[PDB]
Scaffold this active site. Structure first.
Site, PDB file in Angstrom:
ATOM      1  N   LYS G 153       0.814  -1.227   0.000  1.00 34.54           N
ATOM      2  CA  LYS G 153       0.000   0.000   0.000  1.00 34.54           C
ATOM      3  C   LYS G 153       0.845   1.273   0.000  1.00 34.54           C
ATOM      4  O   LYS G 153       0.594   2.157  -0.812  1.00 34.54           O
ATOM      5  CB  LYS G 153      -0.997   0.002   1.161  1.00 34.54           C
ATOM      6  CG  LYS G 153      -1.938  -1.208   1.152  1.00 34.54           C
ATOM      7  CD  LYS G 153      -2.855  -1.239   2.380  1.00 34.54           C
ATOM      8  CE  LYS G 153      -2.143  -1.357   3.734  1.00 34.54           C
ATOM      9  NZ  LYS G 153      -1.213  -2.514   3.835  1.00 34.54           N
ATOM     10  N   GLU G 179       0.078   5.463  11.287  1.00 34.45           N
ATOM     11  CA  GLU G 179       1.163   4.740  10.583  1.00 34.45           C
ATOM     12  C   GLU G 179       2.549   4.918  11.224  1.00 34.45           C
ATOM     13  O   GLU G 179       2.676   5.548  12.264  1.00 34.45           O
ATOM     14  CB  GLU G 179       1.121   5.212   9.116  1.00 34.45           C
ATOM     15  CG  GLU G 179       0.010   4.496   8.347  1.00 34.45           C
ATOM     16  CD  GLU G 179       0.288   2.996   8.175  1.00 34.45           C
ATOM     17  OE1 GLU G 179       1.466   2.629   7.917  1.00 34.45           O
ATOM     18  OE2 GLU G 179      -0.651   2.179   8.325  1.00 34.45           O
ATOM     19  N   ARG G 180       3.618   4.365  10.639  1.00 33.84           N
ATOM     20  CA  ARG G 180       4.969   4.437  11.223  1.00 33.84           C
ATOM     21  C   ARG G 180       5.513   5.861  11.300  1.00 33.84           C
ATOM     22  O   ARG G 180       5.517   6.577  10.308  1.00 33.84           O
ATOM     23  CB  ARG G 180       5.946   3.536  10.458  1.00 33.84           C
ATOM     24  CG  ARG G 180       5.531   2.063  10.342  1.00 33.84           C
ATOM     25  CD  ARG G 180       6.616   1.301   9.578  1.00 33.84           C
ATOM     26  NE  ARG G 180       6.279  -0.112   9.365  1.00 33.84           N
ATOM     27  CZ  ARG G 180       5.450  -0.615   8.472  1.00 33.84           C
ATOM     28  NH1 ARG G 180       4.791   0.111   7.627  1.00 33.84           N
ATOM     29  NH2 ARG G 180       5.304  -1.897   8.376  1.00 33.84           N
TER      30      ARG G 180
HETATM   31  N1  LIG Z   1       7.724  -3.184  -6.030  1.00 31.17           N
HETATM   32  C1  LIG Z   1       8.024  -3.604  -4.806  1.00 31.17           C
HETATM   33  N2  LIG Z   1       9.250  -4.127  -4.577  1.00 31.17           N
HETATM   34  C2  LIG Z   1       9.540  -4.545  -3.340  1.00 31.17           C
HETATM   35  N3  LIG Z   1       8.785  -4.534  -2.244  1.00 31.17           N
HETATM   36  C3  LIG Z   1       7.576  -4.013  -2.501  1.00 31.17           C
HETATM   37  C4  LIG Z   1       7.135  -3.539  -3.719  1.00 31.17           C
HETATM   38  N4  LIG Z   1       5.834  -3.076  -3.615  1.00 31.17           N
HETATM   39  C5  LIG Z   1       5.519  -3.275  -2.363  1.00 31.17           C
HETATM   40  N5  LIG Z   1       6.532  -3.832  -1.626  1.00 31.17           N
HETATM   41  C6  LIG Z   1       6.468  -4.159  -0.208  1.00 31.17           C
HETATM   42  O1  LIG Z   1       5.422  -3.411   0.363  1.00 31.17           O
HETATM   43  C7  LIG Z   1       5.625  -3.347   1.797  1.00 31.17           C
HETATM   44  C8  LIG Z   1       5.133  -2.015   2.315  1.00 31.17           C
HETATM   45  O2  LIG Z   1       3.707  -1.904   2.073  1.00 31.17           O
HETATM   46  P1  LIG Z   1       2.612  -2.051   3.244  1.00 31.17           P
HETATM   47  O3  LIG Z   1       3.234  -2.653   4.454  1.00 31.17           O
HETATM   48  O4  LIG Z   1       1.388  -2.702   2.706  1.00 31.17           O
HETATM   49  O5  LIG Z   1       2.266  -0.516   3.539  1.00 31.17           O
HETATM   50  P2  LIG Z   1       2.132   0.370   4.878  1.00 31.17           P
HETATM   51  O6  LIG Z   1       3.456   1.060   5.064  1.00 31.17           O
HETATM   52  O7  LIG Z   1       1.000   1.332   4.649  1.00 31.17           O
HETATM   53  O8  LIG Z   1       1.840  -0.623   5.972  1.00 31.17           O
HETATM   54  C9  LIG Z   1       7.112  -3.675   2.003  1.00 31.17           C
HETATM   55  O9  LIG Z   1       7.253  -4.961   2.585  1.00 31.17           O
HETATM   56  C10 LIG Z   1       7.691  -3.719   0.586  1.00 31.17           C
HETATM   57  O10 LIG Z   1       8.770  -4.617   0.461  1.00 31.17           O
END
Ligand SMILES: Nc1ncnc2c1ncn2[C@@H]1O[C@H](COP(=O)(O)OP(=O)(O)O)[C@@H](O)[C@H]1O
Ligand SMILES: Nc1ncnc2c1ncn2[C@@H]1O[C@H](COP(=O)(O)OP(=O)(O)OP(=O)(O)O)[C@@H](O)[C@H]1O
Ligand SMILES: Nc1ncnc2c1ncn2[C@@H]1O[C@H](COP(=O)(O)OP(=O)(O)O)[C@@H](O)[C@H]1O
Ligand SMILES: [Mg+2]
Lengths: 50, 509, 456, 177, 74, 50, 456, 74
Positions: G153, G179-180
């Site tokens: 996301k 969020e973080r």
């Molecule tokens: N193209 C990409 N290449 C590598 N990792 C990706 C990619 N797209 C998404 N991710 C992964 O998405 C995660 C962060 O998204 P998410 O945790 O869903 O969002 P949020 O920070 O809102 O919780 C990471 O683990 C990252 O590695």
């Protein structure tokens, strides 16, 4: 081994300071000898301290 | 051995004692049930304050109602009874802090349990606090070496990162985190190990292994065993976090291990259900996300301005940090469960340990296909960063072709070479417990595999080749290993020095 | 001062006491003129306490006087308890008269402190080849026992009871948590006929007793075992079924009106398991080792009860219906059984290599048996045919005659040392005995006895 | 719920009416007599019968008190009975006195001593307490041979311990460490 | 002991000390006692029917849905 | 080291008996700032009888 | 006239005021000595109000005095907010001194009327193949990125922020909701170093914050975006996680005395979303284009929170853990993702037929999953074998290397036009690339790059 | 040679809950006098359903499938 020997000694020294010496809480017997004159001094002390 | 002038210290205690009367705010216990107590009175009690009961027992105020106070007992509640006295202490829930805790085993409130006498800590700090804001943080760019080839090469950890260790029971989660603590003894990073819901015999064995490896003098151990009150099990992580934050705020670096955050969540669910709060998914409280997110937000890297402001100018030009390694147990390998999914949403990446790998003899068990570090790529040292790029892809090619080893003798040259390289990198990534490797030692194993020096070595001898090659460089190239170990730098002179040594090794040993 | 019964709802009784004489949590109370005992669970305020009756409440009425005993439920301890059957309150349930105890202990206490932990990990030698090799028991450990019925579960318990008493000078305690009265009676006679009754103390908490009785029986047996541990001994504590202890807690928690957790279990599930399991450990004076039978609801290993129990187990013994059909006893599965001490750092490299060697041969034989069954014995190579021969010898050498099984087996019982066990399996794996027939290894104490049996 | 949580509205309503009509003294006597009468063992039993209507319970209690209830106080008893809260009367009287004491700027203080304390000492203690509490203090002295000397003062949740018993406990806690 | 019902408020109780008579307030009128999440609890309104419209000060309208013994939830 | 302290423990346990009286009297004069003159006459019987 | 604190339970505080001076709902109150801010939520009667604290309640006590401010929580608005960071109450948290606002607006407001709604279908190119193909966006519309933990996301929202800022010259608002804290610092320094910060207003209420802050911070960010919209501008509104606003309501609902609904959620779940979501809309005065990340609890899309959110959006992008496990990123599910803009009258018949053709092939491949797992591809008809080969190429061609993801792999980012997107998928559907190996389509920006990769 | 004890679907839940104990008591007469008896309880599930009804109407705390804490003891 030498650290464990120091820990044993300090446990004995503390157990002696706790079993014996701390037996001085029997100072209540000395204090049991108090009377109405001394009580008046403690009430004045308490009153000065709210 | 025992002089009478030392046990006479009682006179010093009596001379220092103050017998003057002081005003106390008090109440009386009304009811007692399952570790929760109701109290009548205590008008000056603050929300989150420690309440004092007879026999040295403490409670925490959580329900300040108009006509009564509800408190959770911080220990054994069976000794409390209706009509007993309760007193305000004027103190929010606190624990002792400072260097005096290093090498000691303590309960969730900071009391010593190792039998080595009192703790002479000169300061105390609040257990519950809000983590520092957006502007006070700094990007992670300093490494934290775990000593494992697979983790330090593929899932690098930086100072101030939160890295989740996750997997099924009995597959090396504790081993990986304790070995990471053992490797910090000469790094300058101070350690905190928090044991939540663990067996007392397991905690004692971890402490024995910390002293057998020389790491105990650099570690604080906080224990809340399987039989301790749920209040202490729920609070132990915040006490350990507060002891670890002491170093972060003073411009130093620390590392904390929460041996089981899923046991902390089970303890919080018990208190919430006993308080009759409405449950959600898997019967956990509505605030179960706030429980772990509030804890793990404190692990961070703080800027020089934060340290200068906090220390009133006593510490200048130094950043401070607290790195965290939380542990989670998944039933039957399910990552989609509620508590695991919540912690993945909080941490900066995770190390997944696979049960099938662990039972197949690959003891490290790191599942490279799903394990990842969101901020470690910027923290990894130059030599390991340049040599590790080919390791990750070689294991992917292996996972896709591994079942073909029973028929691979009849495949194309390209697929045969991709599989043969993937098998060698998979065999090289194996490592024994309590056997950490330095930057220079890991660099030799990675260089030999990345530059193709293992192509003529059979799978059954890759481990023997590694131990022989490291032993050889330790006597013939000691000055080169000492140079690499300074800061893990990688110039043309170092590259030339390593290939010359490996070629002489292959040609003579 | 005494109190009065103010409310009765099934097994839950509320008693009112004077404001300055309210009994403590877990304190035992006695109803005047009746044998009913109550255990205080909660203090409700206004001098009223909520308690659970340790027997039937039929015939009780409001206003009856209740006396406080001043302590928790206290049970008889020491040598006087051996060879007798008792209830949750320590009363004798056999017709053999009163127990001759010299001392009584309360059933509730804290687990041994961090400083009391014995420390070094030491093995408990059982004298049984398959257990001592494939799933070694640590002193102070907890062992999960799995399997059906009619597979030798009682005979294995009787052999362990004999060996700890005769070879290690220890004692045993049996806690029948939710015991079936028919089976409890049969087991008492089988131990009497096997001459092991005088070496074990029996505590039964029968299925027809209220939830409080079934919940507290584990603590009663554990309290008797704690006395023997403090005499400087190594003790065995047998728990008939650890699943019924979990259910008794769910029943009591529901009676007390607590809000239920995931899958309907009590909110205190993990803490109630921890309070029981943390007392079973190795201390500086002696140790209590426990063998616990485990039931898995709906065959789901992820269910809260099995999942909470497995966090405390150090070993797993799996009894097999198929192995019992081959006439091999004890019928323990060498591939499904496990142990946390089966680690080269705990048991040493020689024992570990020998145990892993036996498991590798048995695992490969399992695979080859399917090939022989589908394609025939002519498909196997000379190396596979040699491996099949060694697997058959290993499989038979795991069998052993027990002193309590002399009626079934005819042959005299054997106690086998760990040294003799490792040497025997190592020699068969190395091929030192490949000239002997497979029948020479069946029902023999050690490798020496197999060499001698081969000459007959 | 706590009896205090249920008696607060009734105690507050009776106090506001008594204050607005300058009847503070009259209501202290009415509430006090209703509290005492509602706790006698035959009235305690009559106020629990299943056949009596709320109006009959109110009328019975009004007839027993008689002249010790003015017309407003009778309307109040009928209100408490109609709402089914006649068991709160002892707590309503207790809470009414707390509102009246804070309105008149007075405080009730309990005192326990090792020996009988003279009038000069009682006034000396009262003077200091009145100064810190900024209220007219009313002491209730009593004897307790458990103390070996000194006095223990308590005013609500405030507790000042000057007894040598407390000092001996502090000495013990400081030496047992 | 039942919890404090919505009409057990110091002002409602004081009103009865002065006059016990219910007719002293028209059966067509009442007073807001509580306002939470789109739900208003009223004291009085004795001639209200289930579903009847209530006019509140300001042009706001409400509807009776819980005709309880002491209050009307709208 | 454990055997060395067993011997000494016995000696010092008797030596401590001479100090408990002065510790208890220091405690009595700490509780209240008076009676230090009167305590000296009862001390001789009290020290042992405590 | 001031009131006094009468009860404190977690984040919820009850305050008593004189009957003639009770504060209104949503009115802001201040504790006298501590200066903590409270928001009134309910009027309990008898002069008592129930409120939520906008900060930590540790150290507060009963009897403290509270002042009412006469108005709701008000925050600074307009040009003075650009390039600065603010908390839920509108205070600066970037250490850059006080904000220079000309006016302040209350955070609670009614949604724009039916007559104020603006109609529009102007296509917005994202430069991302899967999004531009199956779920196209429109200027002034609402986009939701649905997904479980760790699926992408934030990475997808950061790539959208990077790509949409190329053709947009107006102002932007970013609201960090639950969020973080590290992600907020990273984004702030990235914009400060890129010199883009003076065009963006930043509001943050992260995970470390108490329930009251996480419950109102979304309103503070939206109030700033409404000022720019009402000035006649076109503004972008990004919400870091809209689910956290709902969760903060669940944490406090039981304390507010409400009965729980399905799976423990607040009974007001749908109303709380509607009151917030209707304000995030374009009007006849100006437009708001918004992108919201939507968390999915335990990967269950049927959960009441995600389920109630779908009805509020114009374009729905659904991320999947299964797709991410195959190494395919951005990881968008083409069968679950959709947009109202996917209409022949908006995008033209060529784009519409291509998107429909891709969904048909992927749906048919999904139906063959169990057949292929048990018997393999060889038992399929010649027509099914051809379709499976194209489905496997389409799945790989949907993958794309992002510019913000370059740190995770070193692979350069790629921007793909809608023209190049339609041409590539149309060619694969028509069979123009039936001879290329399926690995040639993985992580390639355009169809030409797939042709070059096939030559290696 | 058979005793038939009936507690039909229209009879009070108390009678349906008690019927197995009444039949057991009639069967125990022979056991205690040195004789053999056989008893059939045609639906122990229906006896549990009757006991659950009584428990819920008596307001006793419910557990899994709404049964009371003593359903195993029954
Ligand atoms: N193209 C990409 N290449 C590598 N990792 C990706 C990619 N797209 C998404 N991710 C992964 O998405 C995660 C962060 O998204 P998410 O945790 O869903 O969002 P949020 O920070 O809102 O919780 C990471 O683990 C990252 O590695
Ligand atoms: N690298 C390794 N090489 C060999 N054995 C290992 C290795 N890492 C761990 N083990 C062994 O794995 C077993 C289980 O390890 P550990 O206790 O750390 O697992 P765990 O998941 O933390 O267990 P638990 O769930 O009980 O806490 C131990 O016997 C340990 O010695
Ligand atoms: N060591 C043994 N040697 C021979 N037969 C055995 C042995 N152990 C068990 N059996 C057989 O198994 C039967 C059932 O054993 P038992 O321990 O009572 O199992 P369970 O309790 O599950 O019914 C015994 O009666 C005996 O016939
Ligand atoms: Mg562990």
């Amino acid at each position: 081994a030498q650290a464990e020997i120091e820990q044993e000694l300090n446990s004995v020294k503390d157990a002696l300071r706790a079993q014996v010496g701390a037996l001085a809480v029997t100072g209540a017997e000395k204090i049991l000898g108090a009377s109405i004159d001394a009580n008046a001094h403690e009430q004045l002390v308490s009153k000065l301290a709210a | 051995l025992n002089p009478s002038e030392i046990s006479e210290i009682i006179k010093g205690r009596i001379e220092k004692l103050d017998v003057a009367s002081q005003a106390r705010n008090e109440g009386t216990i009304v009811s007692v049930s399952d570790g929760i107590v109701r109290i009548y009175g205590l008008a000056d009690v603050m929300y989150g304050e420690m309440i004092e009961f007879p026999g040295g027992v403490y409670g925490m105020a959580l329900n300040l109602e108009q006509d009564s106070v509800g408190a959770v007992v911080l220990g054994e509640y069976q000794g409390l009874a209706e009509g007993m006295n309760a007193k305000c202490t004027g103190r929010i829930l606190e624990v002792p802090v400072g260097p005096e805790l290093l090498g000691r085993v303590v309960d969730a409130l900071g009391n010593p349990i190792d039998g080595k006498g009192p703790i002479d800590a000169k300061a105390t700090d609040a257990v519950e606090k809000v983590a520092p804001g957006v502007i006070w943080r700094k990007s992670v760019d300093q490494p934290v070496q775990t000593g494992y080839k697979s983790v330090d090469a593929m899932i690098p950890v930086g100072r101030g990162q939160r890295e989740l260790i996750i997997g099924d029971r009995q597959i090396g989660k504790t081993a990986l985190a304790v070995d990471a603590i053992i490797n910090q003894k000469d790094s300058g990073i101070k350690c905190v190990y928090v044991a939540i819901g663990q067996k007392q015999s397991t905690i004692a064995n971890v402490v024995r292994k910390l002293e057998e490896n020389g790491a105990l003098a650099n570690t604080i151990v906080v224990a809340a065993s399987a039989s301790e009150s749920a209040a202490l099990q729920y609070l132990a992580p915040y006490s350990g976090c507060t002891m670890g934050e002491y170093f972060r705020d003073r411009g130093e670096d620390a590392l904390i291990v929460y041996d089981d955050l899923s046991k902390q969540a089970v303890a919080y669910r018990q208190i919430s259900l006993l308080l009759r709060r409405p449950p959600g998914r898997e019967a956990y409280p509505g605030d179960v996300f706030y429980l772990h997110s509030r804890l793990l937000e404190r692990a961070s890297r703080v800027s020089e301005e934060y340290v200068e402001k906090f220390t009133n100018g006593a510490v200048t030009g130094k950043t401070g940090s607290l790195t965290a390694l939380p542990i989670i147990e998944t039933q039957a390998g399910d990552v989609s469960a509620f508590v695991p999914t919540n912690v993945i949403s909080i941490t900066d990446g995770q190390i997944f340990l696979e049960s099938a790998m662990f039972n197949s003899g690959i003891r490290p068990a790191v599942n490279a296909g799903i394990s990842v570090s969101r901020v470690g790529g910027a923290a990894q040292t130059k030599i390991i960063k340049k040599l590790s790029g080919g390791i990750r892809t070689a294991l992917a090619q292996y996972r896709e072709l591994a079942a073909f080893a029973q028929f691979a003798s009849d495949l194309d040259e390209a697929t045969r070479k991709q599989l043969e390289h993937g098998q060698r990198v998979t065999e090289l990534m194996k490592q024994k417990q309590y056997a950490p490797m330095s930057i220079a030692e890991m660099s030799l194993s990675l260089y030999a595999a990345e530059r193709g020096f293992l192509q003529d070595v059979e799978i059954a001898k890759v481990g023997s080749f590694e131990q022989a090659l490291i032993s050889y460089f330790q006597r013939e190239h000691a000055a080169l290993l000492a140079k690499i170990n300074e800061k893990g730098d990688f110039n043309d002179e170092i590259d030339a020095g390593i290939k010359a040594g490996i070629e002489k090794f292959k040609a003579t040993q | 001062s005494s109190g009065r019964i103010v409310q009765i709802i099934g097994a839950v009784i509320d008693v009112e006491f004077p404001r300055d004489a309210v009994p403590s949590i877990y304190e035992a109370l006695k109803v005047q003129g009746v044998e009913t005992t109550l255990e205080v669970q909660q203090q409700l305020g206004d001098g009223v306490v909520r308690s659970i009756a340790m027997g039937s409440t039929e015939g009780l009425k409001r206003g009856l006087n209740v006396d406080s005993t001043g302590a928790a439920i206290s049970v008889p301890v020491g040598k006087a308890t051996l060879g007798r059957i008792m209830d949750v309150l320590g009363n004798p349930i056999d017709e053999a008269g009163p127990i001759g105890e010299e001392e009584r202990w309360g059933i509730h206490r804290e687990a041994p402190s961090y400083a009391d932990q014995a420390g070094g990990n030491e093995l408990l030698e059982t004298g049984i080849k398959v257990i001592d090799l494939v799933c070694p028991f640590a002193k102070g450990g907890k062992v999960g026992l799995f399997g059906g019925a009619g597979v030798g579960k009682t005979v294995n318990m009787m052999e362990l009871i004999r060996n700890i008493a005769i070879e290690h000078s220890g004692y045993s305690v049996f806690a029948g948590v939710g015991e079936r009265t028919r089976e409890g009676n049969d087991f008492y006679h089988e131990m009497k006929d096997s001459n092991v009754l005088d070496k074990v103390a029996l505590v039964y908490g029968q299925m027809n007793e209220p939830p409080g009785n079934r919940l507290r029986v584990a603590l009663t047996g554990l309290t008797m075992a704690e006395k023997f541990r403090d005499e400087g001994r190594d003790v065995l504590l047998f728990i008939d079924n650890i699943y019924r202890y979990t259910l008794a807690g769910t029943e009591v928690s529901a009676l007390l009106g607590r809000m239920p957790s995931a899958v309907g279990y009590q909110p205190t599930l993990a803490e109630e398991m921890g309070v029981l399991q943390e007392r079973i450990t190795s201390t500086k004076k002696g140790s209590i080792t426990s063998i616990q039978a485990v039931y898995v609801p709906a065959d789901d290993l992820t269910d809260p009860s099995p999942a909470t129990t497995f966090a405390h187990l150090d070993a797993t013994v799996v009894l097999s219906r198929d192995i019992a059909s081959l006439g091999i006893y004890p019928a323990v599965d060498p591939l499904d059984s496990t142990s946390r001490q089966l680690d080269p750092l705990v048991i040493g490299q020689d024992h570990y290599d020998t145990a892993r060697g036996v498991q590798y041969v048995l695992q490969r034989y399992k695979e080859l048996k399917d090939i022989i069954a589908i394609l025939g014995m002519d498909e196997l190579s000379e190396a596979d045919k040699l491996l099949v021969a060694r697997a058959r010898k290993i499989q038979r050498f795991l069998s052993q005659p027990f002193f309590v099984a002399e009626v079934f087996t005819g042959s005299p019982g054997k106690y086998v040392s760990l040294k003799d066990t490792i040497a025997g399996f190592k020699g068969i794996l190395n091929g030192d005995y490949d000239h002997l027939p497979e029948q020479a290894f069946y029902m023999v104490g050690g490798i020496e006895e197999a060499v001698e049996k081969a000459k007959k | 719920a706590e009896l205090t949580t249920l008696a607060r509205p009734y105690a507050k309503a009776a106090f506001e009416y008594a204050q607005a009509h300058q009847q503070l003294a009259d209501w202290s006597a009415a509430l006090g007599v209703l509290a005492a009468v509602s706790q006698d063992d035959t009235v305690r039993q009559l106020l629990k019968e299943p056949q009596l209507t709320s109006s009959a319970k109110a009328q019975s209690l009004i007839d027993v008190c008689g002249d010790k209830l003015n017309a407003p106080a009778q309307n109040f008893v009928r209100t408490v009975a109609e709402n089914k809260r006649l068991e709160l009367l002892p707590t309503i009287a207790e809470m009414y006195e707390q509102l009246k004491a804070e309105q008149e700027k007075s405080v009730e203080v309990e005192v326990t001593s090792a020996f009988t304390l003279s009038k000069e000492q009682q006034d000396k203690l009262a003077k200091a307490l009145s100064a810190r509490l900024s209220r007219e203090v009313r002491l209730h002295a009593s004897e307790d041979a458990s103390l070996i000397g000194g006095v223990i003062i308590r005013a609500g949740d405030l507790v000042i311990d000057g007894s040598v018993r407390g000092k001996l406990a502090k000495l013990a806690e400081a030496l047992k460490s | 002991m039942q919890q404090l019902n919505p009409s057990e408020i110091s002002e409602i109780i004081k009103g009865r000390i002065e006059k016990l008579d219910v007719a002293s307030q028209a059966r067509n009128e009442g007073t807001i006692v509580s306002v939470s999440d789109g739900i208003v609890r009223i004291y009085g309104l004795a001639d209200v029917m289930y579903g009847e419209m209530i006019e509140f000060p300001g042009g706001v309208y409400g509807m009776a849905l819980n005709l309880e013994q002491d209050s009307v939830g709208a």
